Amino acid sequence: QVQLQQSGAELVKPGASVRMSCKASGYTFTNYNMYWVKQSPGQGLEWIGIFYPGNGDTSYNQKFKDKATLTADKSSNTAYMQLSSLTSEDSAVYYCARSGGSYRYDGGFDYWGQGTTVTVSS
Amino acid sequence: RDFNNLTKGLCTINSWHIYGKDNAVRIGEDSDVLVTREPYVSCDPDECRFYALSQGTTIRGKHSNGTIHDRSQYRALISWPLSSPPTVYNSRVECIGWSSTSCHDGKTRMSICISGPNNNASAVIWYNRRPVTEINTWARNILRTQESECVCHNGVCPVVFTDGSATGPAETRIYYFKEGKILKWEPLAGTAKHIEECSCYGERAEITCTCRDNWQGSNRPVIRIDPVAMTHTSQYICSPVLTDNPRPNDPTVGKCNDPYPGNNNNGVKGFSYLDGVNTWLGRTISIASRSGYEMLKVPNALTDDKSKPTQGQTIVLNTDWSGYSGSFMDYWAEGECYRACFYVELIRGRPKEDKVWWTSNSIVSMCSSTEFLGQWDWPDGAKIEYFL
Amino acid sequence: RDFNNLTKGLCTINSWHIYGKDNAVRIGEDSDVLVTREPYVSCDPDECRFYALSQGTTIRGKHSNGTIHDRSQYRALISWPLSSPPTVYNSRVECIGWSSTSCHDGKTRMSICISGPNNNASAVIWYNRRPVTEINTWARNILRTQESECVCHNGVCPVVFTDGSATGPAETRIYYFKEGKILKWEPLAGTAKHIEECSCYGERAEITCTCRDNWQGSNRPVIRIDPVAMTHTSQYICSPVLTDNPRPNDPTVGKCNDPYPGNNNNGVKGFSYLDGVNTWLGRTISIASRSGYEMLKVPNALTDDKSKPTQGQTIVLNTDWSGYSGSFMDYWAEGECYRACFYVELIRGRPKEDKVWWTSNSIVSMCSSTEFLGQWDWPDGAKIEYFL
Amino acid sequence: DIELTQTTSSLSASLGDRVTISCRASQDISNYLNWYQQNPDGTVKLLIYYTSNLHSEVPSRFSGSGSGTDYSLTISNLEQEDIATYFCQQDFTLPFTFGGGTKLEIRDY
Ligand SMILES: *[C@@H]1O[C@H](CO)[C@@H](O[C@@H]2O[C@H](CO)[C@@H](O[C@@H]3O[C@H](CO)[C@@H](O)[C@H](O[C@H]4O[C@H](CO)[C@@H](O)[C@H](O)[C@@H]4O[C@H]4O[C@H](CO)[C@@H](O)[C@H](O)[C@@H]4O[C@H]4O[C@H](CO)[C@@H](O)[C@H](O)[C@@H]4O)[C@@H]3O)[C@H](O)[C@H]2NC(C)=O)[C@H](O)[C@H]1NC(C)=O
Ligand SMILES: *[C@@H]1O[C@H](CO)[C@@H](O[C@@H]2O[C@H](CO)[C@@H](O[C@@H]3O[C@H](CO)[C@@H](O)[C@H](O[C@H]4O[C@H](CO)[C@@H](O)[C@H](O)[C@@H]4O[C@H]4O[C@H](CO)[C@@H](O)[C@H](O)[C@@H]4O[C@H]4O[C@H](CO)[C@@H](O)[C@H](O)[C@@H]4O)[C@@H]3O)[C@H](O)[C@H]2NC(C)=O)[C@H](O)[C@H]1NC(C)=O
Ligand SMILES: *[C@@H]1O[C@H](CO)[C@@H](O)[C@H](O)[C@H]1NC(C)=O
Ligand SMILES: *[C@@H]1O[C@H](CO)[C@@H](O)[C@H](O)[C@H]1NC(C)=O
Ligand SMILES: *[C@@H]1O[C@H](CO)[C@@H](O)[C@H](O)[C@H]1NC(C)=O
Ligand SMILES: *[C@@H]1O[C@H](CO)[C@@H](O)[C@H](O)[C@H]1NC(C)=O
Ligand SMILES: [Ca+2]
Ligand SMILES: [Ca+2]
């Protein structure tokens, strides 16, 4: 059965960078787009970008290019996201979802991770 | 020899078969192969050849670093024999510039290359391997042309240029040459909003070009030129099967004289063969990047705003990188009709593969068959890790 | 020019003399030489050339790793001038595919290349360097052809294809082309059980091909085609001097319309010149592997089931690797008769030499003499240790 | 890009009834709109995709509809496990955008 498990909560100071993971299971990792989403107070749900482990393609939301970097480890079937130069504006909950349409950009996000919370402040 | 006349119509397209492939990046890992991009194919009464814009270095050479840039004084239009790679020793320089077009008229060949800074560019028209006419920038913002072959009818060869912004309105013109000399030119007419990089073919005394809207249109602008009267018109393709890139997902109903929303201000060069039910459109498989390539039979795509696929053929899988694509035909072949053909540029390197510092490509080319042949996928074939 | 007609008979074969040798693997240790396999030779009214199926890399390049495989989208039929090696810079691509055949008809040349996945392959027939006809797989199991030249008589060029399993029965067909257009085709007739990779030659309005039984026959199947009536027949060679590989040791009495037992379901491409007492068969020296190569005069080998050698000539010693071999003749030479000729592929690399990761070959070619000339042995010449 | 607006962020209802939440797109999105359920524990689940397709193992009391710019989700007979926030999202064009969400509370009193 499809299962996406994410890393634990991060307590960080301003100016730091963090790297979280999303371990995939129950499906062929290389055949699906992996999406990343951000959820915060007074902002809601925002799409960050996409990484396709099949060939390494990526695309970002203009808003998040410069903040995030999508990467993956095809062997361990783990996907990562690094956020740099952390500011309190980045305190939120982060999710990784799978493309319901495999390598296509339709079909919705069919399976999500439980989310990793990043808390930035001194 | 006399001047060629477009006397025939298109043959029935039931499938596509391989015509040519050069494997330039595989061979170039250990050979003197030039870094190129923006290729095409074009025939003479006696032979067809590969064409492309060189970058003035070999793939393995230190000067390949930084080849992502597109305009410099180190580029030129080259031509090599069909299916060999673009080699330092076997390429023939057609002219100097960073934008081009070329075509034979039955008697001899006409080539055009544009060079210069963004605000002071100019085109020099070569006919029979000699300079004949020159044209200065009229909008002072990157004069540029087709990047695939032109077509001629009884000595007259129309060619379309654009000068002005990409992300906005520009001044597009259609020039009518004959022996490298200008017979006339006219500004774009019809409903088309923006016109870039046209892919053209001719049949029954008429020339049809499918182009790129960049600025807005995710559905493509089409131009129809009458080489005898020296007039033209333009419109958009009605079908909801979008064919630009990036582009939004396919809608259920399209737009005939307005571009398609969703995505704007970027694109890629492409083509189509509009012939009633004998209509085939080509497009990338991804809506985000230049990956994959497929042909789709969409009957009456031009005039029908609810047309959908009726048959198809995959050329390059979604995992493999592609790029520009365009059209050509061997107007001097024996037969009762013209066989449609096209090529696809397979880009390797930056920006998608950043472990290397260069950007280059190979070519895959196919033509139509009246048979129903089985398909295969044609990728570049090079292992990027070998270049590290 | 008119269409060539097979008006002459064979000359008397008293011995063989060198015709051509390219030393491709020696030179390729430090040169831009393409990795190839499955070569042949073929003439035009004005010149004879070397042909082979490229692997889309140079021998010294990193992509040479894994070249043992035979079917990919990176192969093509190439031709270079007689005796030079197959170079990136001097080879001319004839077509794209992993199986082929080619031949001139007096007026121009016809080439055929097959490509595609094992269950959806197709052949495209080029005549005068332009696509003319296409044929889809009829048995959905590796459509494949001769791998050596075809022969034409007054415009008509027969060619034999097979589609189906190797280790078992398949559907073999004989197509009759003229100007790249199909005049007709017919399924295999006669006593032959399986037919693969035919080697053909023509004389006195008749074409004779020696082929490979793979499945069972250690003695070879022979086909005789009448290009004027467009009919054929098949049988086996009676002689107990077996010529396939692997194969059992020579028996004292052979079989005329049944294959030879002992070994089955594997083989190698070969040839023979069947002309009464003027008959010569070629074979490898080892019964287990493709080592050595020798010619043997075995009078009436076709019709006599107790025929044995009467004279011989060694081409490659038992210690040296060989491979496929086939036939050709220069039908446009001056003279009263046709001089028989043939080539032998000298394979180097995997599987026999596994210290390297590639597979390639060179070529040695010889033609007949009416004299009794002294012999020499012609090996590849490369030292494998130099590639480590 | 396309902005999605979910009218009313709260829906106090009573177990057993039939609620209806809506989403309106700034432009035509040709039915390329989906619905998600975020539980109060953090879990997110896809309910409907492409205006009305049900994702596997989704209780049949959930249904969706719409066209052009207006779409809706309907839950026939509420159960206790339907207490969550519901979001709508589009995928007609990139970047993907979600709605504001609508908190559904089975009103106690
Ligand atoms: C041996 O040989 C022959 C090859 O000549 C093989 O037969 C052929 O088999 C083909 C593959 O099955 C078959 O092609 C298909 O033809 C149908 C109609 O007959 C056509 O619908 C297919 O095209 C759609 O499907 C492909 C994906 O599979 C899409 O990439 C394509 O774009 C088409 O769908 C998209 O657009 C449609 C119109 O808008 C949408 O309805 C659809 O949802 C889909 O949209 C999504 O994807 C788009 C891009 O990824 C995206 O833009 C959009 O927004 C959505 O996200 C396909 O052409 C050939 O017709 C058939 N040929 C013959 C003569 O039979 C044979 O199978 C081989 N044999 C063996 C034994 O292996
Ligand atoms: C200068 O120039 C000329 C060259 O043009 C030289 O003269 C030539 O010298 C040749 C070598 O002596 C001579 O060839 C021999 O001809 C005889 C008949 O006249 C023929 O029998 C010979 O062939 C057999 O012998 C060789 C091995 O030496 C085998 O490899 C070959 O296959 C033949 O034997 C095999 O098959 C036979 C039939 O079945 C069996 O009877 C036999 O047992 C043997 O079988 C085993 O080996 C097979 C493969 O290895 C295997 O399949 C089987 O199962 C068994 O295991 C050979 O052709 C030329 O005829 C002669 N030419 C002329 C014009 O005179 C001259 O010597 C040179 N001069 C100087 C001074 O050096
Ligand atoms: C094209 O037509 C003109 C008359 O319209 C004729 O002179 C010319 O020869 C034609 N082209 C060819 C190749 O015959
Ligand atoms: C390529 O050139 C750029 C700019 O000079 C430099 O940063 C980079 O290190 C070079 N890369 C290599 C591999 O030489
Ligand atoms: C072959 O024979 C035909 C008549 O059968 C003749 O027209 C043709 O010219 C002959 N070929 C040659 C080279 O003369
Ligand atoms: C050749 O490629 C194979 C498969 O990737 C690999 O195992 C082998 O190590 C390679 N050999 C060399 C010499 O690179
Ligand atoms: Ca566009
Ligand atoms: Ca055998």
Side-chain angles (χ1 to χ4, degrees), chain D residues 30-88:
Chain D
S30 305
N31 291 78
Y32 282 104
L33 181 133
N34 322 301
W35 289 97
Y36 302 86
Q37 175 186 79
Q38 192 190 30
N39 287 18
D41 78 324
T43 291
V44 182
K45 293 182 287 306
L46 171 79
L47 302 183
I48 309 296
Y49 69 94
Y50 205 40
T51 305
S52 61
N53 294 250
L54 246 70
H55 181 42
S56 60
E57 300 179 325
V58 168
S60 317
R61 59 173 183 292
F62 291 109
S63 61
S65 47
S67 72
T69 59
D70 299 92
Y71 303 78
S72 299
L73 175 68
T74 289
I75 311 172
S76 294
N77 305 113
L78 278 63
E79 273 199 288
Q80 205 62 309
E81 63 258 52
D82 292 343
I83 296 179
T85 309
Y86 294 87
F87 298 102
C88 55

Side-chain angles (χ1 to χ4, degrees), chain B residues 17-21 23 25-27 29-32 44-46 60 82-85 87 89-90 330 332-334 339 369-383 386-387, chain C residues 31-32 34 55-63 65 67 71-75 88-89 91-93 95-98 115-117 120-124 126 128-136:
Chain B
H17 76 74
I18 18 82
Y19 180 65
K21 190 183 191 303
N23 300 296
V25 177
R26 277 171 67 82
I27 298 174
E29 181 276 329
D30 197 59
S31 250
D32 299 336
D44 288 1
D46 63 288
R60 224 78 227 233
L82 185 76
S83 288
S84 315
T87 266
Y89 319 111
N90 73 346
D330 174 3
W332 296 269
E334 244 72 89
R339 188 181 202 116
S369 186
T370 56
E371 295 302 317
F372 284 95
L373 311 172
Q375 66 182 349
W376 209 10
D377 59 286
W378 302 91
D380 168 69
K383 275 63 187 165
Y386 287 163
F387 286 89
Chain C
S31 250
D32 299 336
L34 294 170
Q55 288 273 61
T57 344
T58 47
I59 310 180
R60 224 78 227 233
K62 279 166 189 177
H63 297 101
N65 182 348
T67 46
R71 289 170 247 101
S72 73
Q73 28 263 125
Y74 316 116
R75 310 199 63 150
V88 179
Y89 319 111
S91 302
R92 195 217 287 138
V93 171
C95 48
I96 308 286
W98 40 248
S115 69
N120 230 354
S122 63
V124 42
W126 299 55
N128 204 27
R129 318 208 62 95
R130 295 196 178 103
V132 167
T133 301
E134 310 80 47
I135 301 179
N136 205 44

